[PDB]
């Protein structure tokens, strides 16, 4: 099979700019390449054909060049849709491969948390459980610090943490931390606390709650 | 409008079959072949096999043996199956179209499906409300959400009031707990001001059980 | 590596 090389793995540029994609195949392909968009969530979409020839309702931002065993998708002025994993696919040789991708990264200003804490409701404590979740929004860079403490007790290896991809529009992340406790140890406390740290914040932001 | 629709997300039992039905419109199945490519964690990107429009098959090499496309014209399905399936088979699925016959250059895809390969029960999620509070209102934005939890396999969709609530809406992935259930949140900042006048919903479907829940979150 | 949870390379 034809091994289709695809570097680097990560690009992260800030938007306006112009960013290429390399893909390197193992042998001579012609310009037998296509190259797809994959968003999150999404299935993938053809951006270009055969290394150069462009997709009807595509943006004209997008464009391809090369032959033989070297290629570059390239798009002029990156914009905050562009964030996705792009991949190659070579054609010339049966079967068909795909390469490993590059993911697409954007530069922006950076941007605090708002934080935000949620006790456990009352019908999960019905079963037995209880979750307390603690909710960082939309901000940038990614690297955030979540600190929980529950009776100034702090907590760990008890919670887990969630963060999305970039948002397409502002380009912010978001993240939840979520403690878990049984119900039993739930309830033999009182102050609950999550504490934000975020290069975009000037201290550590505290939210907390005492139980009822 | 070319559209290829695939059948929902599931659970295999290790060492069986997976069957997967791809229903296209807006083309003929006499006029196009229809591919289908997968996309694992370990192997990204492959293509498996093809069915053309006359009916003749082709298999990627490591497949022949366990891998069966077949389709109705007339009913415009195609028909995905693969024999004894192992846990590295766990991908998303897709049913693809090129933009010429005889090509290989896919212009149209599916929404995918996303197999999970376990030996596991399918399970259900319990949907809790994250009610929005003083501790969850800041400069008049009101922060709201359902926690989704303890569930078998991946997916759930999460929506918000049918689909017409959607900016501001973050539905975070999904985490494996150790209980081998997986456990997500979904949260939308709102004006509090619409707290009053407003109904918050989020609409969870667990295809693989069948599962749909509509959870109205009210301030406490 | 491909995260099926996203569809996204993580
Ligand atoms: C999974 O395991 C088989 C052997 O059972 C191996 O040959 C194959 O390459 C693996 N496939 C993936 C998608 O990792």
């Known amino acids: 099979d034809i091994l289709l090389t695809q570097s680097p793995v990560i690009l992260s540029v800030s938007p306006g700019e112009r960013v290429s994609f390399s893909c390197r195949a193992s042998?001579?392909?012609?310009?037998?390449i296509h190259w797809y968009q994959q968003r999150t969530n999404g299935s993938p979409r053809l951006l270009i054909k055969?290394?150069?020839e462009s997709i009807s309702g595509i943006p004209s931002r997008f464009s391809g060049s090369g032959s033989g065993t070297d290629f570059t998708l390239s798009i002029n002025s990156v914009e905050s849709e562009d964030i996705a994993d792009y991949y190659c696919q070579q054609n010339n040789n049966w079967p068909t491969t795909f390469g490993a991708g590059t993911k697409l990264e954007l530069k922006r200003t950076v941007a605090a948390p708002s934080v935000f804490i949620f006790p456990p409701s009352d019908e999960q404590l019905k079963s037995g459980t209880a979750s307390v979740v603690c909710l960082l929004n939309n901000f940038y860079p990614r690297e955030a610090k979540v600190q929980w403490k529950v009776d100034n007790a702090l907590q760990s290896g008890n919670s887990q943490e969630s963060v999305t991809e970039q948002d397409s529009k502002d380009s912010t992340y978001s993240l939840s931390s979520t403690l878990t406790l049984s119900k039993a140890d739930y309830e033999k406390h009182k102050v609950y606390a999550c504490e934000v740290t975020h290069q975009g914040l000037s201290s550590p932001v505290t939210k907390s709650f005492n139980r009822g | 409008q070319v559209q290829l629709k695939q059948s929902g997300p599931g659970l295999v039992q290790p060492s069986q079959s997976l069957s997967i039905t791809c229903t296209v419109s807006?083309?003929?199945?006499?006029?196009?072949?229809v591919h289908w490519v997968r996309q694992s964690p370990g192997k990204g990107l492959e293509w498996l096999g093809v069915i053309w429009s006359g009916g003749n098959t082709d298999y990627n090499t490591p497949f022949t043996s366990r891998l069966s496309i077949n389709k109705d014209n007339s009913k415009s399905q195609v028909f995905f199956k693969m024999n004894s399936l192992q846990s590295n088979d766990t991908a998303i699925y897709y049913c693809?179209?090129?933009?010429?016959?005889?090509?290989?250059?896919?212009?149209?895809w599916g929404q995918g499906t996303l197999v999970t390969v376990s030996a596991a029960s399918t399970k259900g999620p319990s949907v809790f409300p994250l009610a929005p509070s003083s501790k969850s209102t800041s400069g008049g934005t009101a922060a709201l959400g359902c926690l989704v939890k303890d569930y078998f396999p991946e997916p759930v969709t999460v929506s918000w009031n049918s689909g017409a609530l959607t900016s501001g809406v973050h539905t975070f992935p999904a985490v494996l707990q150790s209980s081998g259930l997986y456990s997500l949140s979904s949260v939308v900042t709102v004006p509090s001001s619409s707290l009053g006048t407003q109904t918050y919903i989020c609409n969870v479907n667990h295809k693989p059980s069948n599962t749909k829940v509509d959870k109205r979150v009210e301030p406490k | 590596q491909f995260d099926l949870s996203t569809r996204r390379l993580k």
């Open positions: 042998q001579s392909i012609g310009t037998n």
């Open positions: 807006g083309f003929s199945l006499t006029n196009y072949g």
């Open positions: 055969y290394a150069s």
């Open positions: 693809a179209r090129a933009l010429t016959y005889y090509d290989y250059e896919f212009a149209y």
